[PDB]
Amino acid sequence: ENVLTQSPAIMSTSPGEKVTMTCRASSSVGSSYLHWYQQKSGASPKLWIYSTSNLASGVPARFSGSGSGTSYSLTISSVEAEDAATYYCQQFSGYPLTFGSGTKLEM
Amino acid sequence: EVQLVESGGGLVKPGGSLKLSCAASGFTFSSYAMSWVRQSPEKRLEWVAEISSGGRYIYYSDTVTGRFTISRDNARNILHLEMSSLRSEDTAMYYCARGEVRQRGFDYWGQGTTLTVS
Amino acid sequence: KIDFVLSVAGGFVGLGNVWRFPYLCYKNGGGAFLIPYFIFLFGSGLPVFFLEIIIGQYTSEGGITCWEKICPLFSGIGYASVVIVSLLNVYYIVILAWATYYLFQSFQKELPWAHCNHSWNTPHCMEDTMRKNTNFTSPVIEFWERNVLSLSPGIDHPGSLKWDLALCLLLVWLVCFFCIWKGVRSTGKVVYFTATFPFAMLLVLLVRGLTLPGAGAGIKFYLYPDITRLEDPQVWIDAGTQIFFSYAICLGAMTSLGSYNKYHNNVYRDCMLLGCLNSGTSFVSGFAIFSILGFMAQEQGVDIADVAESGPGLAFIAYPKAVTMMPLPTFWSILFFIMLLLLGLDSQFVEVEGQITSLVDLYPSFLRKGYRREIFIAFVCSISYLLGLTMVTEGGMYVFQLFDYYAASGVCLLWVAFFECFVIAWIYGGNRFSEDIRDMIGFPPGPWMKYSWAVITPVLCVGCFIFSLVKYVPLTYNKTYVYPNWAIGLGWSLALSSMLCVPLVIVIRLCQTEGPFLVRVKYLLTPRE
Ligand SMILES: NCCCCC(=O)O
Ligand SMILES: [Cl-]
Incomplete structure (x- = not known):
């Protein structure tokens, strides 16, 4: 199984400051086969970025993503109050599908 | 796609069986693939199984490759997940997601239902 | 990314673009040829190319075995494709023979086609510069006709066998045999040169063509449509079939190439890049060819539609004229013909390799049982050489034209493409095919490909076939020689040798299956595990 690990599990954050969190994969993952999901507290997860660069319909242009091969990361230009949620990286290149550890943004 | 709703969750015992359901509406169910994602109480996401359009x-995770069975009813536009030998570590919340495009990911997620094996 | 484009660079340019496309465009009035060309391009060419690559990747075997996993009843498509390849490999190498003869003739102080003062030259010749001052003949055209070709008055007069051209074919076939036996291919540092030389030469030729004092008229004739009267079934068939021939589709080689491909690097994107650039290089070289034709029209004082031959000799008439007007013409002639030889040799190697692979896969028990594979390759090369001898004679040009028009082009390609698309869309199931493509590459084909396969390609092929049958006109060499009835029958026999494969295989498998007729057809329609 292609294990995906996200380093900053817990991140205290203040409004306005830029925040970046990275996802590490134990195996080669294609650029188009990595996606991120946002999960608000008490709510089902929602797609945020797919293909490591294309933003979903609902996510504002505030978010962006980057990375290739074995290291991936997405950053926030200026975090808002509504940005406090848990983000998981997922690889879709090969089965079984795996999700990252997840970073829960602490305001 | 607009609505994805799961149903059938409840309390079971170790070694028991349960059948989960996921009703779909607002889109052509037969033309989009479906997958189940499991959220443990520790808030960890684990993929369970995927069924093509x-x-x-049919694909399964390593932990449920020989225990769970996924099925779909295109005419009824409803998705089923079948559990045969639920263990103590299977207690979690299950979401049915649309994974037709592998390069785009799970576009929509359902409300989800909690399963306990106490 | 750069390496992948380089590996593509071996296969997205060939003689089909440099040679075949310009002469078909010239034969069909020029601009009027482009509209059905683009219509068929975007209607079927890219979708059918993608479909065959998908088949090859899905089965991961030859072009004949895949239909067993798709539709056992229509397994005759692979047989038709293999006979199409067999017929193509016989007449495609004659182009390389002509190129070799031209290259040997280029090793001279002065190019023989520059002026007409030799023993093989008619007394009606006049220099192009001095022509504008009767039924005069340009030195290049009659050089091609008399020295290289020694054209017979008709196909009914084979004439003598040209020993020089026979030796040229023998040399090219030995080169092919040694390359296939030893597995010689451009994989080291030489791939850079092998890929880059053709486009450098084409760029030089195009720049020379545009700067001629009469390129504007040639470009205008190349791009101006003639929808008023040029809408004929011949132009539709030629434009549609050129798309299939250029991509090497309906031949089954693409299936075998897809077999090699393990997975998808956006195989959709790779197919679109291949097709777009393959059509682009043809359209680009059209400018060079027609600019040369326009300059010759301005210099000779004749119409653009009558300057050169309306046949396969257009590439051997226009390009030598272009290299004649460059500094040190011998140097550029040598480089041009070496480029042409390499471009044809690479695609010849690919095609003979695919044919050998399919034939040994048909009978691995004896052909592939040991070292007999080399003997089989030698046998194939020898038989192909003997078959190509028929097109070396003084009347061999007519045989070459008939073979080009019917054996590996024309109604046969439409037949094969129509059956492939019909089977996948309707019998196997478009939904099932899209499901397979999802499982393989991760995303469905989309509305464009699905609707193309379901309607557009079958409708286009059927409409062109019916339009040709209703408004039938016989094949003519150049635009004045009328083929005899027996020659037309022979060409139709060559086309039917591929067309009849599907019905014959259908009846054979129907008879070779047990149970009632409905049970037979049900068992042969259901795809294998
Ligand atoms: N029938 C295809 C022959 C080689 C393709 C090409 O000339 O581009
Ligand atoms: Cl072309």
Whole structure:
């Protein structure tokens, strides 16, 4: 199984400051086969970025993503109050599908 | 796609069986593949199984490759997940997601239902 | 990314673009040829190319075995494709023979086609510069006709066998045999040169063509449509079939190439890049060819539609004229013909390799049982050489034209493409095919490909076939020689040798299956595990 690990599990954050969190994969993952999901507290997860660069319909242009091969990361230009949620990286290149550890943004 | 709703969750015992359901609406169910994602109480996401649009190809996770069975009803536009030998570590919340495009990911997620094996 | 484009660079340019496309465009009035060309391009060419690559990747075997996993009843498509390849490999190498003869003739102080003062030259010749001052003949055209070709008055007069051209064919066939036996291919540092030389030469030729004092008229004739009167079934068939021939589709080689491909690097994107650039290089070289034709029209004081031959000799008439007007013409002639030889040799190697692979896969028990594979390759090369001898004679040009028009082009390609698309869309199931493509590459084909396969390609092929049958006109060499009835029958026999494969295989498998007729057809329609 292609294990995906996200380093900053817990991140205290203040409004306005830029925040970046990275996802590490134990195996080669294609650029188009990595996606991120946002999960608000008490709510089902929602797609945020797919293909490591294309933003979903609902996510504002505030978010962006980057990375290739074995290291991936997405950053926030200026975090808002509504940005406090848990983000998981997922690889879709090969089965079984795996999700990252997840970073829960602490305001 | 607009609505994805799961149903059938409840309390069971170790070694028991349960059948989960996921009703779909607002889109052509037969033309989009479906997958189940499991959220443990520790908030960890784990993928369970995937069924293709027509059901000809079926994929499972390593932990449930020989225990769970996924099925779909294109005519009824409803998705089923079948559990045969639920263990103590299977207690979690299950979401049915649309994974037709592998390069785009799970576009929509359902409300989800909690399963306990106490 | 750069390496992948380089590996593509071996296969997205060939003689089909440099040679075949310009002469078909010239034969069909020029601009009027482009509209059905683009219509068929975006209607079927890219979708059918993608479909065959998908088949090859899905089965991961030859072009004949895949239909067993798709539709056992229509397994005759692979047989038709293999006979199409067999017929193509016989007449495609004659182009390389002509190129070799031209290259040997280029090793001279002065190019023989520059002026007409030799023993093989008619007394009606006049220099192009001095022509504008009767039924005069340009030195290049009659050089091609008399020295290289020694054209017979008709196909009914084979004439003598040209020993020089026979030796040229023998040399090219030995080169092919040694390359296939030893597995010689451009994989080291030489791939850079092998890929880059053709486009450098084409760029030089195009720049020379545009700067001629009469390129504007040639470009205008190349791009101006003639929808008023040029809408004929011949132009539709030629434009549609050129798309299939250029991509090497309906031949089954693409299936075998897809077999090699393990997975998808956006195989959709790779197919679109291949097709777009393959059509682009043809359209680009059209400018060079027609600019040369326009300059010759301005210099000779004749119409653009009558300057050169309306046949396969257009590439051997226009390009030598272009290299004649460059500094040190011998140097550029040598480089041009070496480029042409390499471009044809690479695609010849690919095609003979695919044919050998399919034939040994048909009978691995004896052909592939040991070292007999080399003997089989030698046998194939020898038989192909003997078959190509028929097109070396003084009347061999007519045989070459008939073979080009019917054996590996024309109604046969439409037949094969129509059956492939019909089977996948309707019998196997478009939904099932899209499901398979999802499982393989991760995303469905989309509305464009699905609707193309379901309607557009079958409708286009059927409409062109019916339009040709209703408004039938016989094949003519150049635009004045009328083929005899027996020659037309022979060409139709060559086309039917591929067309009849599907019905014959259908009846054979129907008879070779047990149970009632409905049970037979049900067992042969259901795809294998
Ligand atoms: N029938 C295809 C022959 C080689 C393709 C090409 O000339 O581009
Ligand atoms: Cl072309």
